[PDB]
Every structure is written in structure tokens, then in C-alpha cells.
Design a protein around this ligand. Structure first.
Ligand SMILES: [Fe+3]
Ligand SMILES: [Fe+3]
Ligand SMILES: [Mn+2]
Ligand SMILES: [Mn+2]
Lengths: 295, 295
């Protein structure tokens, strides 16, 4: 047998975003059951057998920063993360409330300080940055946050770094996005350029998009609740109950792969290949896949 | 008014892939009407008012390389491209037949030579590479193709270069993909490293995914006919009638943005903002968007 072109990944992360849960049982904006949409996705991910190292939620967790929404989100997601053996990484969005998030999501004293955090998963560094501005919807990063980020990034991590934030430092194809985009991206660019940041995970746009920023790949996950219709009349915007899902992140020795996971379903087209049948077929094609360095 | 963080893009491209049309009126694999799926997408893109510089189809145009499929594809797509004022760029996939594609899609003498081509859109270079292997489904790039590519890339283009091919030089999250992946990626990497290639557009995987290859962003568009369900049992594969669409590519002075366009539709969530209302709202937020360098 000959080795496939790439080994199994070093790390696997789920990248979920923009859950927008509300307290109680009403439909989000009277139009979509955000709990049901998120719940269906989590159940599908659970049934798939995926075993990620971490699950990262890139902001807009609660639509109006409601305590009851955070409690519900925690009750849905914590058992999911525990069942998958995954660490859980939460990020602020413009809809969240720092104090209520701390209290009800994190069991931490309420504070209005930016939710900026760092952790390690073995050799991989994850930095959480808070681009939210209390009482506002556009993104900003304070000078103090940039200083902190620069100091953290002064040395690299063995497997490099993933930066998780809400407002992405990239252009949007939707004109309305400019009203609420991350401001003064140049200042963040000066901090990030030349560092070991291998991926910037983001949300906010409610559609799947990717680019680079000062040479670093940016990956924006779409939303679990509702998404932007990119077939809208040019210049406009329409959110819709459709195309929800999340992203899967694979960290390899030499690259990071982002993949869009739409909600499961749709009638089968072509042959369904079971895991067992796939193992047989791959061997019959004369190939083996080299194990992960972290197996 | 203050300027938004990014100007309008220099270039706009549609990136469509894996149409898999067949001759006559039957359903692809007896499961999905590929003509209907493609047709619906084209009509939605047409109605949106998008005016791309080019439309790039990254392979698997005809499912069995049928003359009748190429004739049909041409009849659907050429009027679409003409209506949008866009140039049309065709790329070979493993399902295509070089000779029949040349004859029926391009009005060119039948030849079994690789479909390797170059063109310019103003200052932007587009290179088409043929990763297909007649009679086979995996990807290969001949030594002669690599030499040709290296010679072309010996000098940069003013707006850099987009490389369009079928089999992407990236890992897949689906195990079965290894049986038909691009082989000897290292050799392509030696050619591409350090060149002015700003984006590698690809298909083949039938799901939306992106990564880097020797420091160059790779963007894989999903398929118009049927797509992979990434909530399938780990290790397996299931194609499905759902999540079809294409990608939109925006080339800016400093970055290239790829965005997933799922099929339009779904019930409206939140407020619909017309183009006119958006212009008003953006101005009311105290912002203007700087015009394209190519306006
Ligand atoms: Fe949001
Ligand atoms: Fe295909
Ligand atoms: Mn947001
Ligand atoms: Mn293919």
C-alpha cells in the first residue's frame, strides 16, 4: 500500500457561530426556532461520531444577552462537548452581554472587561479576542487589547495559534455589513503580521466566507439560526431560514483545512459507502492513510 | 462620511463546479435533475444583478463526457455569461473527455492533450490546469505540465494570478477522497511556491472547503448537482440532493475573498433591506464605500 498525500490531522475543532438563542420558547425574530436549528445540528454532529479536540463558538451566543438564553445554551452544549470529549471555547459577539455571559455561561464574577482569554490544547494555542463594543454593533479592538495580544504573540506555540473572534478582518460581499464591520483593521494587522497565527476563526456575517488578513487565513463560519441569502438583489440583504450549519477545522502539520458542514439530510445521490466499505475500498485502491501525530 | 475598511473589489468572478450534466432528460444517477439544479442557480444569479468579470467552471462539466451534455451545458451557460457581460473559463475534471469537450464546448479540433490554458482579464492572469488523467479518476500533473506552468509563472502579472484546476492540492475530511486525490502534490508545490498565484480555485470534493498549499489559498467550490453530507458516519460517504450552489470570488488590492452561495430561498428572517434602503442606511451610519480601481 502507498501513503495518501496527507496524514490524519494533528487537531480537529468544530467551529460553530451565531447561535442567537433567546430566553423561553418563542421563535427568533418571530421567524425561526433557533433552539431547534442548533439542536438538530448538535444531534447530527453527535451521531456522526466526530471526536474533536475542541468546540469553538465565535460569538452572538445569546441574541439579547439574556441570562435564560445562556443557561439554555449551556444546558444544550455542555453535555454535547462532554459526550464528544471536547474542550469548549466561548467567544463574545455584538449581541452578547459580557456580564451575563460571565455569570451564566462561565460561573465567573460579572465584569464588563473584554472577554480576552488564552488556553492550550497540547501544543496548539487558542486565543479568544473580544471585538464587541458594549451598546454597539460594529467591532473594535482597544489599544489595551492590542498590547495584550502582541505580548502573548511575542513567542510562538509548537503547533502555532488559532485566533478566535467575532467580527472578521475581511471585506464582506454585502454592503450593509460595513455599518457593523470591525473598525481600524490596520492596527490589528500590525500586531498579527509575522506571528504564528495559523487561522483566524470568525462569525458575524451569517454566511460562509474566507480570505486572508496580513497573510493569515481567515475563516468565517455561517450561523446556526438563519443565514444571509447571497442571491439577493445586488446591494441589499435578506436573512433566511435555510443553509444553516457550522464549520469543521482540521489542523495538519503543514496546513489548516476549513470545511462547511450544512445541516444533514437530502435524498441520497449515488452510492452510500459505509465506514467499513470505505476501509475496504481504500485498501483495494492500494492506499493507506498515515495516522495522526497525536493518535 | 468615513470610508469603509475595504474598497469595492478590483475583480469579481463566479466560481462554479461539478455540474455533471448528462445527455437527454434523465436524472443524474437516477436521483437528481442536474439540469434543473444548475438552471435554478443560474436564474438566481442572473436575477441578483451580479456582474462578474468572469465565470470559472472548475471541472466535471459533463458526467460521462457526452457530446449532448456539452452542447446542453453550452446552450445554458453561454447566454448566461453574455447577459452578465462575463468571460467564460472552462476547466477539465475527471468525468470530462478532452476531445469531446474541445469539439462541443470549445469549437476546437479534438485533441487528447491536457487542457492547459492561460488568459488575461485586464491585469489579472488566469491559468487553467488539467489535473485529469484519461481513463482514471485520481489527479496527476505531468512533468511537461509542471514545466509549462513554471515557465508561465516565471514572471508575475500586475494583479497576480488565479490558478483554476479540478483536483485540489489539499487534505479532504472524507476518507474515500484519497482514492481519487491529486497525486504527487510535492512536485506542484515546488513550482507554485513563491509565485504570484493568489488563489487556487478547485472542485472535485463536492463540499465547500478551503486551506493553503505552499502558502497559497486554495478554495474548493461545492457542486451544482449534489453534495457530500458532512454529517455522515465518520469514515463513510453519502452524496445528497441538497446544499448545492457555487462560490463568489472578490479580488481586492490586498486579499482575495471566497464566499459560498447556496441555492437561494428559505423564508425571510429579520428585516429585508432593499438596495435603495441599504444605500440610505449606510449613509445614515456615516459610511461610504470607496469605488473599485476598475470602476
Ligand atoms: Fe450574528
Ligand atoms: Fe465531480
Ligand atoms: Mn454579530
Ligand atoms: Mn471530480
Amino acid at each position: 500500500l502507498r501513503a495518501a498525500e496527507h496524514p490524519r490531522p494533528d487537531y480537529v475543532l468544530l467551529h460553530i457561530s451565531d447561535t442567537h438563542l433567546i430566553g423561553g420558547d418563542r421563535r427568533l425574530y418571530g421567524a425561526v426556532d433557533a433552539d431547534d436549528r442548533l439542536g438538530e445540528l448538535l444531534e447530527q454532529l453527535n451521531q456522526s461520531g466526530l471526536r474533536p479536540d475542541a468546540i469553538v463558538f465565535t460569538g452572538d451566543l445569546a441574541d439579547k444577552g439574556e441570562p435564560a438564553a445562556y443557561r439554555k445554551l449551556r444546558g444544550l452544549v455542555e453535555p454535547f462537548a462532554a459526550q464528544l470529549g471536547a474542550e469548549l471555547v466561548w467567544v463574545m459577539g455584538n449581541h452578547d452581554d459580557r456580564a451575563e455571559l460571565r455569570k451564566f455561561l462561565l460561573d465567573e464574577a460579572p465584569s464588563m472587561a473584554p472577554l480576552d482569554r488564552v488556553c492550550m490544547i497540547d501544543g496548539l494555542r487558542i486565543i479568544v479576542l473580544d471585538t464587541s463594543v458594549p451598546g454597539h454593533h460594529h467591532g473594535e479592538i482597544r489599544a489595551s487589547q492590542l498590547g495584550w495580544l502582541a505580548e502573548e504573540l511575542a513567542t510562538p506555540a509548537p503547533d502555532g495559534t488559532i485566533l478566535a473572534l467575532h467580527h472578521p478582518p475581511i471585506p464582506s460581499v454585502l454592503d450593509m455589513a460595513v455599518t457593523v464591520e470591525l473598525r481600524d483593521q490596520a492596527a490589528l494587522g500590525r500586531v498579527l503580521r509575522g506571528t504564528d497565527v495559523r487561522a483566524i476563526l470568525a462569525g458575524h456575517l451569517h454566511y460562509s466566507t474566507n480570505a486572508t488578513f496580513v497573510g493569515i487565513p481567515v475563516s468565517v463560519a455561517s450561523a446556526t439560526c438563519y443565514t444571509q441569502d447571497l442571491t439577493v438583489a445586488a446591494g441589499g440583504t435578506r436573512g433566511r431560514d435555510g443553509a444553516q450549519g457550522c464549520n469543521l477545522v482540521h489542523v495538519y502539520p503543514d496546513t489548516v483545512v476549513h470545511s462547511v458542514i450544512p445541516l444533514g439530510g437530502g435524498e441520497t445521490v449515488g452510492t452510500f459507502v459505509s465506514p467499513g466499505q470505505a476501509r475496504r475500498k481504500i485498501a483495494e485502491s492500494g492506499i493507506f492513510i498515515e495516522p495522526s501525530r497525536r493518535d
